[model samples]
Target: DDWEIPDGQITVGQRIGSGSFGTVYKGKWHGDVAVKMLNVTAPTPQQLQAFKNEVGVLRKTRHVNILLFMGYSTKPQLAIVTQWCEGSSLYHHLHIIETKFEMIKLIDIARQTAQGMDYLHAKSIIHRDLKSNNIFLHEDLTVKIGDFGLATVLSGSILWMAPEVIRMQDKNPYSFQSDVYAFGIVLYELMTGQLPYSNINNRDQIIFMVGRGYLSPDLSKVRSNCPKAMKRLMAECLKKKRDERPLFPQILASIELLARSLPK
Candidate 1:
């Protein structure tokens, strides 16, 4: 990761988050910034390459809904920086922080996220990981996509993760449709507070079931009150076959339409 900003102009602050890539911090990049730094001096081939590829992907994407790439540091430790999001990750707000909002507000956030993914898909880039944890919100509830796939491990919030990438028997190839599947899962999460298959108590059982494409939260519950169009969209996105899933453009359009039909 690289930025045009000068090192002297910005300073790192206290750590705020952690991941397989390393630790994230609430720092200042002239204005505000989020810095993810690693403790590794001699990094692995995967670490070096994945971090660099993540940076390249971030560089290719620039939209209001996507996290802005700030810079990088290899001095004190390996680091990648992005514009600071003032609010919490969607995961924290929904789970840990236990904050609630009107349905319209949630739709607006979902719309912005779809728009961001739409941008990435248009550029022929697959986010690989699209979960509530990867999405952040500002004080005003504006959505922004962050941590655009820099992790090598698959432990955090894998419930929303698409089945094709689950890596068990025969791993399915990841495509834009895989992202659509993930967005549908996110939508399901938005409507119902429970993570998919949360009732299942075992991790190995979770993986076994999900990897075989046998588990998904019962979406039938949402059909009643959920908008017909949104319900249809989810059904299409969550299809077991990748070809049956809608593309990002279609997903974005459906979300925007649904958001508009809802009253603020």
Candidate 2:
């Protein structure tokens, strides 16, 4: 099958970063590819199968905003390979902007990321987790959402998650609506340079407040600084009702308008 790893073709370089389940490495495969070596010190059959499941998700959905899948190691380290993004993650890109031009480009990146998320939703794929750290930014400024490990518990990513996800009373899956919520948080990060509820020392308090429909107080500040269109979009995206949240298509339209109004 085309999805199968060639088994003998990869050569690992330096470890690039730490993955939630593994260590990512700068590695070679036909050319340069990111190698996420699953860090299950000892992989049980179930854990091994889980890795395959995530890979299967990657195989099923392909888009420019989503990371490009290459292949994986079937055993031992159980690494998942994908195309290397030279400019690194969106998290990294946000911190390095030193000028007005660099600042304005964030608008394009935000809209492009929304378009990517829209594509994934159109294909019926739920990223489950969408954050700046999981999004890759190319040198050309395009973004790719990566890190598809199944949601169990998130340490810091919980800030980007939705109110419904904060409380798990129902068995319903975290699908498009939750992803839209996370995108709203990502929008906060993109525009305001702060992840929602990140400064709160008590995560339990954050969770409790979120469960009660307490969105970030930063929205007003963001609204003041960002476009009028962005204020409307963020308000819609942060809505508590799943049905009330703006679908990615609506979000795409908002982003298109925002992008149009920005200075090139």
Candidate 3:
């Protein structure tokens, strides 16, 4: 099978995680490098496209906050090799650490995120899934964007997507602004440590709220302790109208200013 590991390569580590598409295992290569094997059955055309696209995107992108792809294998098994991020994800850090993340920390992460988005947008790529769980943080507090499985090139109804995406009315081809909208949800997640629209679990209700323009996230309700500027910025990102959302570069500038003012 294409997914099987070769003989003599011991399964030294346990499986660390699994997603809708495949399982990920932690392993060592040549006794020096760590690896993640994506044990996948036959992938659909779209899934194969995503895999190829992610590799190309990672290969072209060079930023302090984006994951670095050392190499990949499409031959014996589908695997991605990259430098290990030892510090875990922002999702785990927030849940385990007792202290509140200062405004500076949040803004720093946001800035890095915006930078990655800006770079992607420049190349006309859209990362449909942007969230805390997908962001990897390093020991130095730098953030790296991960999980490009849902990413695709911009087209179709992506700008009108929040409502459209949930309803399955359209394929909602991704766009830069749509990515900003997803980023807004991520910002909301970071401040509140909660999922957006948690109360409305039903898919229909979620779609209804989004279509009516009543699904805007209330940052104040989540993290009253967060700075006013941060709240306002989040609001701009979450705007129901795609035209109302701030451009990624503009958001990056705002985050840079906010980050500078926060205490270390």
Which segments of model 2 are wrong by more than 4 Å? 39-42, 95-103, 151-156, 223-225
Candidate maximizing lDDT = 2
TM-score of every model versus the real structure: 0.89, 0.89, 0.81
lDDT of 3 by residue, 44-81 (tens): 67657666766666666677677766666665556665
C-alpha local distance difference test of each model: 0.74, 0.76, 0.67
Task: Order candidates by lDDT, high to low.
Answer: 2, 1, 3
The candidate, 2 or 3, that scores higher on lDDT is: 2
Q: List candidate 1 stretches off by more than 4 Å.
A: 1-9, 150-157, 168-172, 223-225
Give the Å shift of residue 115 in candidate 2.
1.1
Worst 10 residues of 2 by lDDT: 94-103
Per-residue lDDT tens digits for candidate 1, residues 133-191, read 88888775788887765522155666765666676336446778878888888787776
| Per-prediction backbone clash count | 0, 0, 0
Off by over 4 Å in 3: 1-12, 30-36, 40-46, 95-99, 154-161, 168-173, 201-204
